[PDB]
Write an enzyme that holds these catalytic residues in place. Structure first.
Site, mmCIF file in Angstrom:
data_model
loop_
_atom_site.group_PDB
_atom_site.id
_atom_site.type_symbol
_atom_site.label_atom_id
_atom_site.label_comp_id
_atom_site.label_asym_id
_atom_site.label_seq_id
_atom_site.Cartn_x
_atom_site.Cartn_y
_atom_site.Cartn_z
ATOM 1 N N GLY A 27 0.779 -1.233 0.000
ATOM 2 C CA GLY A 27 0.000 0.000 0.000
ATOM 3 C C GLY A 27 0.812 1.286 0.000
ATOM 4 O O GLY A 27 2.047 1.276 -0.007
ATOM 5 N N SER A 28 0.081 2.393 -0.003
ATOM 6 C CA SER A 28 0.611 3.761 -0.009
ATOM 7 C C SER A 28 -0.508 4.632 0.592
ATOM 8 O O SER A 28 -1.574 4.094 0.903
ATOM 9 C CB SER A 28 0.924 4.175 -1.450
ATOM 10 O OG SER A 28 -0.244 4.135 -2.248
ATOM 11 N N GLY A 29 -0.297 5.933 0.835
ATOM 12 C CA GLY A 29 1.002 6.576 0.869
ATOM 13 C C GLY A 29 0.999 8.001 0.364
ATOM 14 O O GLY A 29 1.283 8.249 -0.814
ATOM 15 N N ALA A 30 0.736 8.948 1.266
ATOM 16 C CA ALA A 30 0.587 10.358 0.869
ATOM 17 C C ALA A 30 1.752 11.157 0.205
ATOM 18 O O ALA A 30 1.416 12.018 -0.600
ATOM 19 C CB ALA A 30 -0.163 11.194 1.949
ATOM 20 N N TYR A 31 3.072 10.993 0.446
ATOM 21 C CA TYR A 31 3.945 10.613 1.627
ATOM 22 C C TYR A 31 4.875 9.396 1.506
ATOM 23 O O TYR A 31 6.007 9.454 1.980
ATOM 24 C CB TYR A 31 3.409 10.800 3.053
ATOM 25 C CG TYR A 31 2.760 12.126 3.379
ATOM 26 C CD1 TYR A 31 2.987 13.279 2.618
ATOM 27 C CD2 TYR A 31 1.886 12.213 4.455
ATOM 28 C CE1 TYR A 31 2.329 14.478 2.930
ATOM 29 C CE2 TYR A 31 1.246 13.387 4.771
ATOM 30 C CZ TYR A 31 1.463 14.511 4.011
ATOM 31 O OH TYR A 31 0.803 15.658 4.385
ATOM 32 N N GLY A 32 4.428 8.315 0.874
ATOM 33 C CA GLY A 32 5.327 7.201 0.604
ATOM 34 C C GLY A 32 4.641 5.940 0.140
ATOM 35 O O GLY A 32 3.434 5.908 -0.007
ATOM 36 N N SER A 33 5.429 4.906 -0.103
ATOM 37 C CA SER A 33 4.930 3.587 -0.496
ATOM 38 C C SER A 33 5.571 2.551 0.405
ATOM 39 O O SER A 33 6.734 2.683 0.786
ATOM 40 C CB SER A 33 5.319 3.261 -1.938
ATOM 41 O OG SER A 33 4.397 3.831 -2.840
ATOM 42 N N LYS A 49 9.078 1.414 4.185
ATOM 43 C CA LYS A 49 8.457 2.551 3.515
ATOM 44 C C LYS A 49 9.512 3.396 2.803
ATOM 45 O O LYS A 49 10.462 3.879 3.444
ATOM 46 C CB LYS A 49 7.693 3.408 4.520
ATOM 47 C CG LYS A 49 6.980 4.611 3.899
ATOM 48 C CD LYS A 49 6.077 5.297 4.894
ATOM 49 C CE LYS A 49 5.258 6.406 4.236
ATOM 50 N NZ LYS A 49 4.307 7.042 5.213
ATOM 51 N N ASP A 146 -4.786 13.592 14.968
ATOM 52 C CA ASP A 146 -5.433 12.864 13.861
ATOM 53 C C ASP A 146 -5.658 11.399 14.212
ATOM 54 O O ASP A 146 -5.423 10.489 13.398
ATOM 55 C CB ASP A 146 -4.584 12.982 12.591
ATOM 56 C CG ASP A 146 -5.369 12.704 11.328
ATOM 57 O OD1 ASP A 146 -4.731 12.379 10.311
ATOM 58 O OD2 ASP A 146 -6.612 12.788 11.348
HETATM 59 C C1 LIG Z 1 3.724 11.764 11.686
HETATM 60 N N1 LIG Z 1 3.789 10.686 12.701
HETATM 61 N N2 LIG Z 1 3.347 11.067 13.979
HETATM 62 C C2 LIG Z 1 3.475 9.932 14.698
HETATM 63 C C3 LIG Z 1 3.128 9.836 16.165
HETATM 64 C C4 LIG Z 1 2.496 11.131 16.661
HETATM 65 C C5 LIG Z 1 2.118 8.702 16.372
HETATM 66 C C6 LIG Z 1 4.424 9.622 16.957
HETATM 67 C C7 LIG Z 1 3.990 8.858 13.979
HETATM 68 C C8 LIG Z 1 4.153 9.388 12.706
HETATM 69 N N3 LIG Z 1 4.618 8.893 11.547
HETATM 70 C C9 LIG Z 1 4.289 7.692 11.035
HETATM 71 O O1 LIG Z 1 3.323 7.062 11.457
HETATM 72 N N4 LIG Z 1 5.075 7.264 10.031
HETATM 73 C C10 LIG Z 1 5.058 6.026 9.458
HETATM 74 C C11 LIG Z 1 6.262 5.530 8.934
HETATM 75 C C12 LIG Z 1 6.319 4.274 8.316
HETATM 76 C C13 LIG Z 1 5.146 3.506 8.216
HETATM 77 CL CL1 LIG Z 1 5.209 1.897 7.417
HETATM 78 C C14 LIG Z 1 3.931 4.000 8.715
HETATM 79 C C15 LIG Z 1 3.890 5.258 9.342
#
Ligand SMILES: Cn1nc(C(C)(C)C)cc1NC(=O)Nc1ccc(Cl)cc1
Ligand SMILES: CCCCCCCCO[C@@H]1O[C@H](CO)[C@@H](O)[C@H](O)[C@H]1O
EC number: 2.7.11.24
Length: 336
Positions: A27-33, A49, A146
């Site tokens: 999946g994806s991904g605003a932002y990434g894949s 990712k 969010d």
């Molecule tokens: C922007 N952000 N803010 C948080 C919190 C506040 C939960 C620490 C965590 C994140 N970032 C993410 O959730 N990033 C992220 C990186 C890799 C994968 Cl596979 C999925 C998600």
């Protein structure tokens, strides 16, 4: 330095250490894949990712740096953290691509609510884990802003991690003061979202499925009632005041009725979360000590975060400065 191999996955070249085998797009991904991969060091399946234009602009570059700072800091069972971070770039001059490696969870909470008829025990366990992660997040002076089902990763064990970036949404879960703007808010904006999530898991219905920001406010007031005088006094905005006060005075509903059939301890907790006055909303730390979680709560196993330096959020830097700082964060990374 690891040996890298390259592979085209959906029209981009992925270049990852040979440690990571059998990349498979998830999946994806605003932002990434994101691909699922086999981690040959640990024998565990992981998520990789690839970021996606991480240094496009100042906004992308700061978001990228923020990723590295947040994820390197987050060290908690119910919060996403970093297993690995790499770039194929030797030197800063070549630095263009960032890859993040984290636990592969496989599903989100939205998937669970839509398929499974959840028992009260499931709701206890799920909300408990959210609040436990949230206590940790809030202790680092971070507001999620969010929290919604698609930002909550859940495995087959019903174990949960809070994420910031998803793969139902987003205004349905949003605290009323955010959609009024306000500015300017506290951590309990997240507690409002948890209440919306918890309500939905109990009933299998979105609590406040607004069509827009104005419908959202209407629906919230239907349940919680018109604000009292002490709350109305705090609203600077004339048009917000006119909208609120023009809704023909709403009596607060009997949460007992709205949530009939639910564990009355669940209802009591919902009443404490879904309060209009954010000063009066239960905090994550208080909610964990609520009787609803008696079977799960251990005050000696609900830890808080090391202090987190987010002064960078203040800064307006150039792309190459954010890039250089991100590069520094990649290089200094120490795995768990
Ligand atoms: C922007 N952000 N803010 C948080 C919190 C506040 C939960 C620490 C965590 C994140 N970032 C993410 O959730 N990033 C992220 C990186 C890799 C994968 Cl596979 C999925 C998600
Ligand atoms: C649906 C419209 C009802 C208005 C919601 C009232 C929100 C009350 O929450 C308010 O949040 C502010 C921002 O954190 C604080 O400064 C106030 O002290 C607090 O009372």
């Amino acid at each position: 330095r690891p040996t890298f191999y390259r592979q085209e996955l959906n029209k981009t070249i992925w270049e990852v250490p040979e440690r990571y085998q059998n990349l498979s797009p998830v999946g994806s991904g605003a932002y990434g894949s994101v691909c699922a991969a086999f981690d040959t060091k640990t024998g565990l399946r992981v998520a990789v990712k690839k970021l996606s234009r991480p240094f496009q602009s100042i906004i992308h570059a700061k978001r990228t740096y923020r990723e590295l700072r947040l994820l390197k800091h987050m060290k908690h069972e119910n919060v996403i953290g970093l297993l690995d971070v790499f770039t194929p770039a030797r030197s800063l001059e070549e630095f263009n691509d960032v890859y993040l490696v984290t636990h592969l969870m496989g599903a989100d909470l939205n998937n669970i609510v839509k398929c499974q008829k959840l028992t009260d025990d499931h709701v206890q366990f799920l909300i408990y884990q959210i609040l436990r992660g949230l206590k940790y997040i809030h202790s680092a002076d971070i507001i999620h802003r969010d929290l919604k089902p698609s930002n909550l990763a859940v495995n087959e064990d019903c174990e949960l991690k809070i994420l910031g970036f998803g793969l139902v949404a987003t205004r349905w879960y949003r605290a009323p003061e955010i959609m009024l703007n306000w500015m300017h808010y506290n951590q309990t904006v997240d507690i409002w979202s948890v209440g919306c999530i918890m309500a939905e898991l109990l009933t299998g219905r979105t609590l406040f499925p607004g069509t827009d920001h104005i419908d959202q406010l209407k629906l919230i007031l239907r349940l919680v009632g018109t604000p009292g005088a002490e709350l109305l006094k705090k609203i600077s905005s004339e048009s917000a005041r006119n909208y609120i006060q023009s809704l023909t005075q709403m009596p607060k509903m009997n949460f007992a009725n709205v949530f009939i059939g639910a564990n009355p301890l669940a209802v009591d907790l919902l009443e404490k979360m879904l309060v209009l006055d954010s000063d009066k909303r239960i905090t994550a730390a208080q909610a964990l000590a609520h009787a609803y979680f008696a079977q799960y709560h251990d005050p000696d196993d609900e830890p808080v975060a090391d202090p987190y330096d987010q002064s960078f959020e203040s800064r307006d830097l150039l792309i190459d400065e954010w890039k250089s700082l991100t590069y520094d964060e990649v290089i200094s990374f120490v795995p768990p």
